[PDB]
Amino acid sequence: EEAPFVIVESVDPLSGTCMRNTVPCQKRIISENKTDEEPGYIKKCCKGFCIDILKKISKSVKFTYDLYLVTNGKHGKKINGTWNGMIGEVVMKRAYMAVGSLTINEERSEVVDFSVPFIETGISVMVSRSNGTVSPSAFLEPFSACV
Amino acid sequence: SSVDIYFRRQVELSTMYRHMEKHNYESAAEAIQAVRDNKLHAFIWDSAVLEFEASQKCDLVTTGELFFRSGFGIGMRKDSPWKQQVSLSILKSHENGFMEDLDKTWVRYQECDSRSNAPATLTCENMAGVFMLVAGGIVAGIFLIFIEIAYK
Amino acid sequence: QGLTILVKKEIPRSTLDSFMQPFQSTLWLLVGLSVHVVAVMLYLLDRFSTLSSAMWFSWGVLLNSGIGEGAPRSFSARILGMVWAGFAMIIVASYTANLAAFLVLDRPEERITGINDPRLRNPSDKFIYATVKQSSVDIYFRRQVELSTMYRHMEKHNYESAAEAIQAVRDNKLHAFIWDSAVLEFEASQKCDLVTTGELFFRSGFGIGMRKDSPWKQQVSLSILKSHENGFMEDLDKTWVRYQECDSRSNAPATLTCENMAGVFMLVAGGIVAGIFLIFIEIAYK
Amino acid sequence: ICTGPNDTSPGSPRHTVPQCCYGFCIDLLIKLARTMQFTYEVHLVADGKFGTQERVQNSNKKEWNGMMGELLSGQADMIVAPLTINNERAQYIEFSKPFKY
Amino acid sequence: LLWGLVFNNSVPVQNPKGTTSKIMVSVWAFFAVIFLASYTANLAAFMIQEEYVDQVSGLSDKKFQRPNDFSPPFRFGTVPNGSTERNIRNNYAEMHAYMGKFNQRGVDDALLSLKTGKLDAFIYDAAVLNYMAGRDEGCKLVTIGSGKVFASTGYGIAIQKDSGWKRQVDLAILQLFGDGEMEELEALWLTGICHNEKNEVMSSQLDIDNMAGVFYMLGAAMALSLITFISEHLFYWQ
Amino acid sequence: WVMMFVMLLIVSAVAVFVFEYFFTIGKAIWLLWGLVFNNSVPVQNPKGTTSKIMVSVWAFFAVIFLASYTANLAAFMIQ
Numbered sequence A: 001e002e003a004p005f006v007i008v009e010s011v012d013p014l015s016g017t018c019m020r021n022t023v024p025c026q027k028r029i030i031s032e033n034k035t036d037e038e039p040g041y042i043k044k045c046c047k048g049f050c051i052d053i054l055k056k057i058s059k060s061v062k063f064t065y066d067l068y069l070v071t072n073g074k075h076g077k078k079i080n081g082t083w084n085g086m087i088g089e090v091v092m093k094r095a096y097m098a099v100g101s102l103t104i105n106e107e108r109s110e111v112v113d114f115s116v117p118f119i120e121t122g123i124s125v126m127v128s129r130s131n132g133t134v135s136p137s138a139f140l141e142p143f144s145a146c147v
Numbered sequence B: 001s002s003v004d005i006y007f008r009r010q011v012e013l014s015t016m017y018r019h020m021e022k023h024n025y026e027s028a029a030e031a032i033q034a035v036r037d038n039k040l041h042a043f044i045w046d047s048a049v050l051e052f053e054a055s056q057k058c059d060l061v062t063t064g065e066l067f068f069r070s071g072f073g074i075g076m077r078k079d080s081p082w083k084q085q086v087s088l089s090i091l092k093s094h095e096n097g098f099m100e101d102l103d104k105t106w107v108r109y110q111e112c113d114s115r116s117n118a119p120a121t122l123t124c125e126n127m128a129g130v131f132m133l134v135a136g137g138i139v140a141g142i143f144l145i146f147i148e149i150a151y152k
Numbered sequence C: 001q002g003l004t005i006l007v008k009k010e011i012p013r014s015t016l017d018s019f020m021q022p023f024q025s026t027l028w029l030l031v032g033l034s035v036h037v038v039a040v041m042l043y044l045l046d047r048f049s050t051l052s053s054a055m056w057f058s059w060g061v062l063l064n065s066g067i068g069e070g071a072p073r074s075f076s077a078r079i080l081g082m083v084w085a086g087f088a089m090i091i092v093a094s095y096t097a098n099l100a101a102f103l104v105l106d107r108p109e110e111r112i113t114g115i116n117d118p119r120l121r122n123p124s125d126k127f128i129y130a131t132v133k134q135s136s137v138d139i140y141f142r143r144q145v146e147l148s149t150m151y152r153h154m155e156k157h158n159y160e161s162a163a164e165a166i167q168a169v170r171d172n173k174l175h176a177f178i179w180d181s182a183v184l185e186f187e188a189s190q191k192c193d194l195v196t197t198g199e200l201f202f203r204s205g206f207g208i209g210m211r212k213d214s215p216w217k218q219q220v221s222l223s224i225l226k227s228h229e230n231g232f233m234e235d236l237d238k239t240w241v242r243y244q245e246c247d248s249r250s251n252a253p254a255t256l257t258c259e260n261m262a263g264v265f266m267l268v269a270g271g272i273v274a275g276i277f278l279i280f281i282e283i284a285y286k
Numbered sequence D: 001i002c003t004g005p006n007d008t009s010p011g012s013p014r015h016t017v018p019q020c021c022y023g024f025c026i027d028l029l030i031k032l033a034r035t036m037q038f039t040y041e042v043h044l045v046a047d048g049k050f051g052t053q054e055r056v057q058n059s060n061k062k063e064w065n066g067m068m069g070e071l072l073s074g075q076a077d078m079i080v081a082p083l084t085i086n087n088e089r090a091q092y093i094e095f096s097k098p099f100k101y
Numbered sequence E: 001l002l003w004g005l006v007f008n009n010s011v012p013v014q015n016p017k018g019t020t021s022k023i024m025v026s027v028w029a030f031f032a033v034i035f036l037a038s039y040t041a042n043l044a045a046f047m048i049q050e051e052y053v054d055q056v057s058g059l060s061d062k063k064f065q066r067p068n069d070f071s072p073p074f075r076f077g078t079v080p081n082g083s084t085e086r087n088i089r090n091n092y093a094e095m096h097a098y099m100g101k102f103n104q105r106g107v108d109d110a111l112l113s114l115k116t117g118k119l120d121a122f123i124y125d126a127a128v129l130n131y132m133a134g135r136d137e138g139c140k141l142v143t144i145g146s147g148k149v150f151a152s153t154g155y156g157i158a159i160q161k162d163s164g165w166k167r168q169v170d171l172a173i174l175q176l177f178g179d180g181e182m183e184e185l186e187a188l189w190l191t192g193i194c195h196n197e198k199n200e201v202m203s204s205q206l207d208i209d210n211m212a213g214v215f216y217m218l219g220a221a222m223a224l225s226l227i228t229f230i231s232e233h234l235f236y237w238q
Numbered sequence F: 001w002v003m004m005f006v007m008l009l010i011v012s013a014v015a016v017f018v019f020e021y022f023f024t025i026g027k028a029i030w031l032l033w034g035l036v037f038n039n040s041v042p043v044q045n046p047k048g049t050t051s052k053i054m055v056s057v058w059a060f061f062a063v064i065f066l067a068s069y070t071a072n073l074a075a076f077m078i079q
């Protein structure tokens, strides 16, 4: 949930759920763990683009799942030969799959295994739009050479 | 091909498919020469094969909106020992910058460009009325001249 | 009936500052010099082979006034004056043409094309739309999901009764309103500064209410159907709705007015002024 | 040295004659070969089609066409060519990662 | 006389006698009043143009490889400390360093620097820009076409290696592609407002660059006039 | 549409009574009317080098006024 691909919406006390094209998701958050304070609590309720892919896949291949957020290291960035975050969680068997914003590259195709890409992406450029102008020779347009 | 595979197993395009079955061609090399002869009015294919046309020739042009999304790939029988090494060597060729070099060498010429098709300046074949009337004026003069000499 | 939107029918009023608008403030200067340029250059090519006369001719071919009587007598000066006339024609042709092009594309706004308009899909503080609290419209929007953001926006403004929403649209405190078509259409006809956006929405039909399992149900629901072939409901319709007192068609392209042509009248007044000065200078030079 | 069968268009006796081919895919193929030590040969499809399933024999037996059928029949080994990626072919064949979106 | 009549009333003229000629001339005048009308009319069509976005190639074009021909505005920018830079920092190292004077913050502080003329272009990930292009209402800010992206990769699902689940999720995703569902989610979630076409914008004031052509012809006529004055003045031996 | 006419009358009156200062009493309205719509007929137009400028100002105004009319009217012809 570092993206407009998947979104977390804080839990609703008006009903107790979301249930509108949404799904629950945990966050076993540990913080200020200087007194061995046991972690965990239900953070926001989840929904987003990758989430819908998830649901439809689950109903088409018949499993069930257990969504929970990461703690540290948003994506995989190796440090001292170790993976932190969404790729560690797959290499330490503390998970089975990881969905969301997660690109593809050799540096990851040895630790984890990858699915078929479902979006295009890469490096591209943004520009602004130039207003419409008039040729320096407009005043000769409206008559073919003969006339 | 894959396009008819896409249209058949689609249902909202039942009538579309029902229409196409009567005309589909043998290979794009024929469909292009059939569009440039006005024996056809459209054609549907893989974008990256059309875009090379709008650039080499420049009397054809596409209609922008990007359709069903895919990606080309290589084919190997299921469970072959070569699979993993190949699918790795590909990914190498997308950060060292190799595929960009192949791209530029073979596609992306942009030799012809289109922008704001002109509002079609007039020409010699429709202003023909006024020149006819001035000629006819020349004629009538050679008649109505003598009538003066007579009335003199 | 169904649901529609009720917006304020803007009165078209063409935007135009002054007559200089089709020319970049430099181009005026460029021609105001080049005229004198060609004037002087013409004054020579007749002596070396009438100065005031040449200046008149030059600065008067462009103005299309017949004032000015001289004429180049050379060969060269004639060949110049011809293309000078041509260029003067081009100037005015281009000015009026570009003015025409600007005056076409100057059209006021775009009415909402229904619910599929993206202008509604995205909330903005510069565009407020509401309904009546605790009705069927909010029931329709709540239990819909694609309209989650829509509903999330509306909750902050919904009104108490259409009698307030209409008086709030006709005061530009609001920009839209959604309700039962057959209640809006009576508005676009009684008053005629409001008009709807056509596209018919979620479909329904009014009805009568009785507690479940009442002895009156069947007879009532029969007597209704009688009143749709004898022709009774048509009579009620015509008596109460369908006045068509005001009609709309092809909102005009907003004729010009006294408040934007004010430039040229200013310049002719100023011309009157300068005359009362430059008159005496003549008497002096006499 | 492109070993092509299509000296003439289909509908006439074919006299498979050597040709030569080049372009995007041939360059990519040569890169792969240098990377993984192959020795390749190339022969063009005898069908001139991409390939799809179709009933035959006035029956319900499902067979493919063209180069896809030439792979599944072991007649070929690898399709280095502009071949798309879909579900219906994915159940008989192994697709590399995509090399052109 | 006739030249004057075609363009517009210029000067007194000793025009005709000869009551026949007093009719030929009128025919010509009618022709002129129609010809000028046709010109003024059709020219009012050539003055409604469309917006214009430049046809720039990918990162490989001259505008970045040799960013010193038109020195002033070349402002390829980026965002610091991220995966975007490294790919640039490993293929265009010099063109990486040049960008050092263009580090933005976040992404909004960069999208703004394209509406206030501080920057030329901007380099970032595709699928986030595209969704961000459909955000702003000022459609004067829209990316270049696809097929020009540099390092085409995708988005994927991470599976523990060697699992048997892999084959099935692949076939399932190709299924979602197969029956048009993916477009439904894509359209509901990513594609926003600005899938529109370039407007017919009325021009601004005509300016000297636009109308220079008439002035060059005016000057050329001035020169030709000088030349004829010279040629005639050669007549001092007769 | 009538401010034009009132300016017309005013300028004509001041024109002749400026011309007085260094055959042209009502021939003005003729001249100016012609100038507004388009060239109609010979006119004993001015003397009085000042008036030879008031008239030119009017002519400029006319060449702008006719342009505005022809232009905006080309909008009312698309229904």
Ligand SMILES: N[C@@H](Cc1cc(-c2ccc(Cl)cc2Cl)cc(CP(=O)(O)O)c1O)C(=O)O
Pocket: A002, A003, A004, A075, A076, A101, A102, A103, A104, E079, E081, E082, E083, E084, E085, E125, E127, E128
């Ligand atoms: N997708 C990449 C990570 C990754 C993510 C983003 C990103 C962040 C926020 C949003 Cl809302 C959208 C996007 Cl796409 C951007 C980049 C590019 P950079 O961080 O260099 O600016 C990146 O690498 C992965 O798979 O690890």
Ligand SMILES: *[C@@H]1O[C@H](CO)[C@@H](O)[C@H](O)[C@H]1NC(C)=O
Pocket: A129, A130, A131
């Ligand atoms: C284009 O014209 C619009 C008109 O409002 C203006 O806001 C914008 O700044 C112009 N852009 C350029 C690059 O001149």
